[PDB]
Amino acid sequence: TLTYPFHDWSQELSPRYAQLRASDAPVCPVVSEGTGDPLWLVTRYATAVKLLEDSRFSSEAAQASGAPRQEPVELRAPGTRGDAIAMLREAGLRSVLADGLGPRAVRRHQGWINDLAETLMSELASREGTFDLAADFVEPLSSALVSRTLLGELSADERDLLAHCADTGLRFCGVTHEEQVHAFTQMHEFFLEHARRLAGTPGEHLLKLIAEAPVPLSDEALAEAGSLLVVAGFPTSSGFLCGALLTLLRHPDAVQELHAHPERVPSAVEELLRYTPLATGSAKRMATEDLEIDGVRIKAGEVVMVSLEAVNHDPDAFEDPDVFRPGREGPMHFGFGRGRHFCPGNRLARCVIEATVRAVARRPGLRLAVAPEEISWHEGLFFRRPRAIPATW
Ligand code: HEM
Ligand SMILES: O=C1N[C@@H](Cc2c[nH]c3ccccc23)C(=O)N2CCC[C@@H]12
Ligand SMILES: O=C1N[C@@H](Cc2c[nH]c3ccccc23)C(=O)N2CCC[C@@H]12
Ligand code: NA
């Protein structure tokens, strides 16, 4: 009877997640508000490990057109596959994905990412008055990450178009179904027209590595790779960096510790990934056969969701789970997932989060110019994001 998701669009997690977690079942039935599909929902760390490390629960099967699902419209342009990352690994591009997303990419890019973070923060510090950390720090930094490491250099109008498509398509509510579908169409048509151009510009952005890779990727396939990098890399990084700055600004003692002890910043990055919520939906997998999870039978074809926010706030895994405690020394967080589908963007994500944390830690006194309650949130996004983050020294 419980409908999903829980409309917890700000950083305050829905109390439903703790209620289910403490329930007597390790897996609980819900219904998709957007489709009426019955779904299963996992909220406990121990059960989540088991689900996401069992390859008979398939991610691709849960993404496929026609699967039971939490999202109101399919997350693809009509007529296209929608499984880009599978398709690129499919065509033998694991090596390419590693060179473009792995440690060597971070080594190529970490210099300018930290230069840009400081330059942005320095300019804001030079301002008389308040400023907006979302529009004035996160947007330029996340846009530069997308252009330089993922797609190739975008104009401001192209960045805005891709951001709008992602915000419109990656939603539970607040737009009509047809608008959502059309956002995916527009984004596909943008890369049908522009992916080869972007791939051909100088740089080592991933889309170039993909387009130049031996396998002849079609325009449609290269367009799907472009769309994947937007949906997976852009609203995620923007939303998270926004949420992480909010967390830091609400924990000046933690920031002061990092200012005095910069060697502690990596531990703080990992705690932000646990503590700061991002997705308002759930990672999900389809039972490819009849399966059982901690005693509950899951029939073939049924989809099991795991809320990574719920798992990350599981008190059986993390003591005082709702406390931001850098260095807490508990189990691995789920902010990048678990198992085979662990976020491949995790190296670049950690790079940009770390650069942001260090930029903040170097400048104590940075604070919200309004109360946390006065922050306004985009309602219905998959990936939480505030409308603005008024801030000042
Ligand atoms: C910056 C913050 C980011 C966060 C918090 C994050 C988080 C995640 C998580 C939790 C998943 C797993 C979803 C699942 O289990 O089904 C995932 C998957 C993925 N991420 Fe990230 N991500 C971020 C950034 C990025 C970036 C920058 C890229 C690439 C440029 C990226 C590329 C991907 C891809 C392609 C997948 C799909 C993996 C698969 O389904 O096999 N992510 N991400
Ligand atoms: O590569 C994928 N993986 C999963 C999880 C995911 C990772 N990043 C996402 C961004 C938005 C929605 C889902 C995800 C998925 O649902 N996918 C549909 C869009 C991208 C595709
Ligand atoms: O809210 C969602 N989360 C991702 C998984 C994910 C969980 N946490 C993430 C963080 C970054 C990227 C993806 C994820 C997913 O598969 N979805 C299908 C529709 C809703 C959407
Ligand atoms: Na798997």
Author numbering: 3 to 217, 221 to 398
In the authors' words:
Further, the in vitro assay confirmed that NasF5053 could produce NAS-C (47.4%), Asp-A (44.4%), as well as a minor product NAS-B (8.2%) (trace I). NasF5053 adopts the prism-like fold characteristic for P450s, consisting of a large domain of 10-helices (C-L) and a small domain of four α-helices (A, B, B’, and K’) and three β-sheets (strands β1-1 to 4, β2-1 to 2, and β3-1 to 2). Our systematic mutagenesis studies on the promiscuous NasF5053 and the versatile NascB identified four key resides, Q65, A86, S284, and V288, which play critical roles in controlling product regio-configurations and stereo-configurations. To obtain insights into the structural basis for regio-specificity, stereo-specificity, and chemical versatility, we further determined high-resolution crystal structures of wild-type NasF5053 in its substrate-free and substrate-bound form, and of two NasF5053 mutants (Q65I-A86G and S284A-V288A) in their substrate-bound forms.
